[PDB]
Short mmCIF file of C-alpha atoms and ligand atoms in Angstrom, two decimals:
data_model
loop_
_atom_site.label_atom_id
_atom_site.label_comp_id
_atom_site.label_asym_id
_atom_site.label_seq_id
_atom_site.Cartn_x
_atom_site.Cartn_y
_atom_site.Cartn_z
CA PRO V 1 -71.88 -64.26 -16.39
CA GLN V 2 -71.11 -68.30 -18.38
CA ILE V 3 -72.03 -70.95 -16.09
CA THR V 4 -71.11 -74.89 -16.87
CA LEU V 5 -71.97 -77.31 -16.25
CA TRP V 6 -69.54 -80.25 -14.52
CA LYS V 7 -71.00 -78.59 -11.19
CA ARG V 8 -74.16 -78.09 -9.64
CA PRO V 9 -75.17 -74.74 -10.32
CA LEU V 10 -75.49 -73.69 -7.46
CA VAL V 11 -75.59 -69.36 -6.47
CA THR V 12 -76.49 -67.92 -3.18
CA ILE V 13 -80.16 -66.11 -3.49
CA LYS V 14 -82.07 -63.96 -0.78
CA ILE V 15 -85.81 -63.53 0.18
CA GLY V 16 -87.57 -62.94 3.07
CA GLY V 17 -83.53 -60.95 4.20
CA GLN V 18 -82.00 -64.73 4.04
CA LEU V 19 -79.65 -65.31 2.14
CA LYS V 20 -79.88 -69.51 0.88
CA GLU V 21 -78.05 -71.72 -1.83
CA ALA V 22 -80.17 -72.57 -4.48
CA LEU V 23 -80.28 -74.52 -7.48
CA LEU V 24 -80.70 -72.90 -11.07
CA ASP V 25 -83.04 -74.98 -12.96
CA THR V 26 -83.99 -75.02 -16.36
CA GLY V 27 -86.08 -78.11 -15.92
CA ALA V 28 -88.66 -76.38 -13.62
CA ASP V 29 -90.79 -74.66 -14.66
CA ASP V 30 -91.64 -73.11 -11.26
CA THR V 31 -88.95 -71.97 -8.77
CA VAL V 32 -89.84 -73.81 -4.98
CA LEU V 33 -87.56 -73.66 -1.66
CA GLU V 34 -87.95 -75.80 1.35
CA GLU V 35 -89.52 -74.81 5.02
CA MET V 36 -88.81 -71.29 5.07
CA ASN V 37 -90.49 -68.84 7.19
CA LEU V 38 -91.72 -65.52 4.47
CA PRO V 39 -93.52 -62.78 5.45
CA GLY V 40 -96.48 -62.50 3.49
CA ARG V 41 -100.08 -63.98 2.78
CA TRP V 42 -100.15 -67.76 1.00
CA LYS V 43 -102.49 -70.28 -0.70
CA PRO V 44 -101.83 -73.86 -0.87
CA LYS V 45 -101.19 -75.52 -4.62
CA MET V 46 -99.65 -78.67 -5.54
CA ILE V 47 -96.30 -79.50 -7.81
CA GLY V 48 -95.51 -82.58 -9.02
CA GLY V 49 -92.19 -83.51 -10.08
CA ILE V 50 -90.44 -86.96 -10.80
CA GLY V 51 -91.70 -88.95 -8.13
CA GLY V 52 -94.79 -87.44 -7.73
CA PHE V 53 -96.52 -84.98 -5.95
CA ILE V 54 -96.30 -82.83 -2.72
CA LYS V 55 -98.00 -79.89 -1.02
CA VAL V 56 -97.26 -76.40 -1.23
CA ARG V 57 -97.66 -73.01 0.02
CA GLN V 58 -97.22 -70.31 -2.98
CA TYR V 59 -96.21 -66.64 -2.25
CA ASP V 60 -96.40 -63.97 -4.64
CA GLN V 61 -95.00 -60.99 -5.56
CA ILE V 62 -91.42 -62.31 -3.84
CA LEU V 63 -88.48 -60.88 -3.85
CA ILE V 64 -85.97 -62.27 -5.21
CA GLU V 65 -82.14 -62.05 -5.71
CA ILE V 66 -79.23 -64.04 -7.35
CA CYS V 67 -76.22 -63.22 -7.97
CA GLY V 68 -77.07 -59.32 -7.86
CA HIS V 69 -80.43 -60.09 -10.01
CA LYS V 70 -83.52 -58.49 -8.89
CA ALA V 71 -86.25 -60.85 -9.42
CA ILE V 72 -90.41 -60.30 -8.05
CA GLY V 73 -92.29 -63.11 -8.43
CA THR V 74 -94.43 -66.32 -7.38
CA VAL V 75 -92.03 -68.95 -5.08
CA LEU V 76 -92.97 -72.68 -3.54
CA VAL V 77 -92.07 -73.46 0.00
CA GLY V 78 -92.49 -77.02 0.81
CA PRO V 79 -90.03 -79.97 1.61
CA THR V 80 -88.63 -80.46 -1.34
CA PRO V 81 -85.31 -81.76 -1.40
CA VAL V 82 -83.53 -78.73 -3.08
CA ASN V 83 -84.28 -75.48 -3.53
CA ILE V 84 -84.36 -74.86 -7.07
CA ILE V 85 -84.86 -72.01 -9.16
CA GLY V 86 -87.17 -72.40 -12.67
CA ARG V 87 -88.31 -70.40 -15.21
CA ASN V 88 -90.39 -68.48 -13.69
CA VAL V 89 -87.22 -66.33 -11.66
CA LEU V 90 -84.52 -67.82 -14.60
CA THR V 91 -86.79 -65.20 -17.26
CA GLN V 92 -86.45 -62.45 -15.23
CA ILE V 93 -82.70 -62.66 -14.37
CA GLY V 94 -82.35 -62.73 -18.61
CA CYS V 95 -80.65 -66.50 -18.07
CA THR V 96 -80.16 -68.50 -21.65
CA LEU V 97 -78.74 -71.67 -22.80
CA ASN V 98 -76.75 -71.32 -25.34
CA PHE V 99 -74.31 -74.79 -27.34
CA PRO D 1 -77.23 -71.99 -30.67
CA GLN D 2 -79.50 -69.85 -27.99
CA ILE D 3 -82.81 -70.79 -25.96
CA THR D 4 -84.99 -68.89 -24.09
CA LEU D 5 -86.70 -69.80 -21.48
CA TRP D 6 -90.18 -68.90 -21.35
CA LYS D 7 -90.95 -72.30 -22.50
CA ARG D 8 -89.84 -75.71 -21.75
CA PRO D 9 -85.63 -75.77 -23.53
CA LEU D 10 -87.49 -79.14 -25.21
CA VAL D 11 -85.01 -79.97 -28.32
CA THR D 12 -84.89 -83.32 -30.59
CA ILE D 13 -82.36 -85.89 -29.33
CA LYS D 14 -81.20 -88.96 -31.21
CA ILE D 15 -80.40 -92.51 -28.77
CA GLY D 16 -80.64 -95.95 -30.06
CA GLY D 17 -81.43 -95.16 -34.00
CA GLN D 18 -84.73 -92.66 -32.57
CA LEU D 19 -85.45 -89.64 -31.96
CA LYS D 20 -87.48 -87.85 -28.74
CA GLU D 21 -88.05 -84.85 -27.79
CA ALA D 22 -85.95 -84.26 -24.47
CA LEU D 23 -85.85 -81.56 -21.48
CA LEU D 24 -82.98 -79.77 -21.49
CA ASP D 25 -82.40 -79.92 -17.44
CA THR D 26 -79.29 -77.86 -15.91
CA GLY D 27 -80.74 -79.61 -12.50
CA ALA D 28 -80.82 -82.68 -13.67
CA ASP D 29 -76.46 -84.96 -12.68
CA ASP D 30 -77.80 -87.55 -15.06
CA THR D 31 -80.13 -87.60 -18.25
CA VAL D 32 -83.31 -89.59 -17.23
CA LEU D 33 -84.99 -90.93 -21.23
CA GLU D 34 -88.71 -92.19 -20.85
CA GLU D 35 -89.17 -96.54 -20.91
CA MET D 36 -87.16 -97.61 -23.79
CA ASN D 37 -85.62 -101.32 -24.68
CA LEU D 38 -82.71 -100.91 -24.40
CA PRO D 39 -79.60 -103.60 -26.09
CA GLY D 40 -77.29 -103.61 -23.08
CA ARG D 41 -76.12 -104.23 -19.54
CA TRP D 42 -77.50 -102.98 -17.24
CA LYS D 43 -77.77 -101.80 -12.99
CA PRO D 44 -80.32 -100.33 -11.53
CA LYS D 45 -80.67 -97.20 -9.86
CA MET D 46 -82.66 -95.20 -7.77
CA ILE D 47 -83.15 -90.89 -8.15
CA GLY D 48 -85.20 -88.19 -6.40
CA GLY D 49 -86.58 -85.78 -6.78
CA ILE D 50 -90.15 -83.40 -5.72
CA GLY D 51 -91.84 -86.10 -5.20
CA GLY D 52 -90.02 -89.08 -4.39
CA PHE D 53 -88.55 -91.75 -5.79
CA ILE D 54 -88.01 -94.15 -9.33
CA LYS D 55 -86.92 -96.60 -10.04
CA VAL D 56 -84.84 -96.39 -12.65
CA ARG D 57 -82.52 -99.28 -15.24
CA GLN D 58 -78.64 -97.18 -15.63
CA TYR D 59 -76.31 -98.37 -19.10
CA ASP D 60 -73.29 -96.30 -19.69
CA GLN D 61 -71.66 -95.66 -22.46
CA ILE D 62 -74.58 -94.92 -24.58
CA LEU D 63 -74.58 -91.69 -27.37
CA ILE D 64 -77.10 -89.22 -27.99
CA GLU D 65 -76.81 -86.34 -30.63
CA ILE D 66 -78.58 -83.40 -29.31
CA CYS D 67 -79.33 -81.69 -32.12
CA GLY D 68 -76.12 -82.74 -33.97
CA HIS D 69 -73.43 -82.58 -30.91
CA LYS D 70 -72.57 -85.12 -29.89
CA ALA D 71 -72.20 -86.65 -25.90
CA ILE D 72 -71.46 -91.25 -25.14
CA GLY D 73 -72.19 -91.42 -21.51
CA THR D 74 -74.78 -92.72 -19.87
CA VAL D 75 -78.66 -92.41 -19.85
CA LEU D 76 -81.49 -93.85 -17.28
CA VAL D 77 -84.11 -94.89 -18.29
CA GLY D 78 -86.98 -94.97 -15.98
CA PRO D 79 -90.77 -94.27 -15.72
CA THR D 80 -90.07 -90.72 -15.78
CA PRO D 81 -92.96 -87.70 -17.41
CA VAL D 82 -90.47 -86.22 -19.42
CA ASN D 83 -87.50 -87.45 -21.63
CA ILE D 84 -85.18 -85.07 -19.18
CA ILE D 85 -81.10 -84.02 -20.85
CA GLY D 86 -78.37 -83.53 -17.64
CA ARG D 87 -75.31 -81.97 -16.91
CA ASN D 88 -73.84 -85.46 -17.25
CA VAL D 89 -74.42 -84.48 -21.01
CA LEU D 90 -74.44 -80.78 -20.67
CA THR D 91 -71.58 -80.33 -20.55
CA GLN D 92 -70.44 -82.69 -24.01
CA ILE D 93 -72.54 -80.89 -26.40
CA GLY D 94 -71.03 -77.91 -24.43
CA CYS D 95 -74.05 -75.89 -23.31
CA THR D 96 -73.67 -73.37 -20.94
CA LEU D 97 -76.12 -70.78 -18.47
CA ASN D 98 -75.69 -67.77 -18.92
CA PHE D 99 -76.44 -64.79 -17.72
C1 LIG I 1 -85.43 -81.75 -8.28
C2 LIG I 1 -84.61 -81.68 -8.91
C3 LIG I 1 -83.03 -81.13 -7.30
C4 LIG I 1 -84.31 -82.96 -9.61
N1 LIG I 1 -85.17 -83.53 -11.33
C5 LIG I 1 -84.39 -81.82 -12.91
C6 LIG I 1 -85.71 -80.95 -12.02
O1 LIG I 1 -85.42 -79.50 -13.15
C7 LIG I 1 -87.29 -81.21 -12.00
C8 LIG I 1 -87.22 -81.91 -14.04
C9 LIG I 1 -88.66 -82.54 -13.73
C10 LIG I 1 -89.51 -82.21 -14.96
C11 LIG I 1 -91.37 -82.17 -15.18
C12 LIG I 1 -91.46 -82.96 -14.37
C13 LIG I 1 -90.70 -84.12 -14.27
C14 LIG I 1 -89.57 -83.35 -13.65
N2 LIG I 1 -88.16 -79.99 -12.14
C15 LIG I 1 -89.29 -79.58 -11.36
O2 LIG I 1 -89.29 -81.01 -9.67
O3 LIG I 1 -89.78 -78.26 -11.17
C16 LIG I 1 -90.94 -78.24 -11.36
C17 LIG I 1 -90.92 -77.40 -10.69
O4 LIG I 1 -91.56 -76.48 -11.69
C18 LIG I 1 -92.61 -77.71 -12.34
O5 LIG I 1 -91.47 -77.43 -13.30
C19 LIG I 1 -91.43 -79.36 -14.10
C20 LIG I 1 -91.78 -80.62 -12.50
C21 LIG I 1 -91.98 -79.18 -11.39
S1 LIG I 1 -85.48 -84.59 -11.23
O6 LIG I 1 -85.98 -83.86 -11.82
O7 LIG I 1 -85.89 -84.48 -10.26
C22 LIG I 1 -84.01 -85.30 -11.39
C23 LIG I 1 -82.71 -86.47 -10.49
C24 LIG I 1 -82.09 -86.71 -11.05
C25 LIG I 1 -81.63 -86.63 -12.82
N3 LIG I 1 -80.96 -87.86 -12.17
C26 LIG I 1 -81.66 -85.82 -13.33
C27 LIG I 1 -83.92 -85.70 -13.09
#
């Protein structure tokens, strides 16, 4: 669909059999989710944001569905203020910016 | 135009009579620009994200031109690692997400 930006672009996503609300974030290279129980092996990693760096759990080849669009990519799990959907996932669902 | 998400959506902006590269960021409520000596009054503010918070200076009713699209609104100035164009400006230039 076309999504205007007068509100936060929040969407219901499905990961690990759970539904969650996430923010479509064209300023994030990577997708970062709040603390959660995800099945599958993971590797430690660090990501930095506007305020510094945090510790995350990196899950590769994770199934994600966004508004009926399926993705399979890396998901970082850690103390992010918000579930954010980064470009690694947004490209898989064919998301573009237009003005 | 249409901008894909394979790479960071960097564009040229014009503010305070200066040209700069900024990130079109649907995940940002407000525009936040690298440290620059803007004139006029301002109010302190703190914005938070991954890594915590940074303190910024909020100027209101600032003219920004994004690839020819004119906008006027709030602009936050502070030690951000990247120039960020937020929804407050993305709405004024008619930007949308599409997938
Ligand atoms: C986390 C979001 C809810 C909000 N952020 C915008 C977001 O797009 C930042 C914007 C951003 C981009 C680069 C550097 C710092 C901040 N990107 C980000 O944190 O992505 C991280 C995950 O993937 C990596 O890619 C970039 C950083 C990593 S934010 O920078 O902290 C922010 C908060 C408030 C305002 N008014 C403006 C921006």
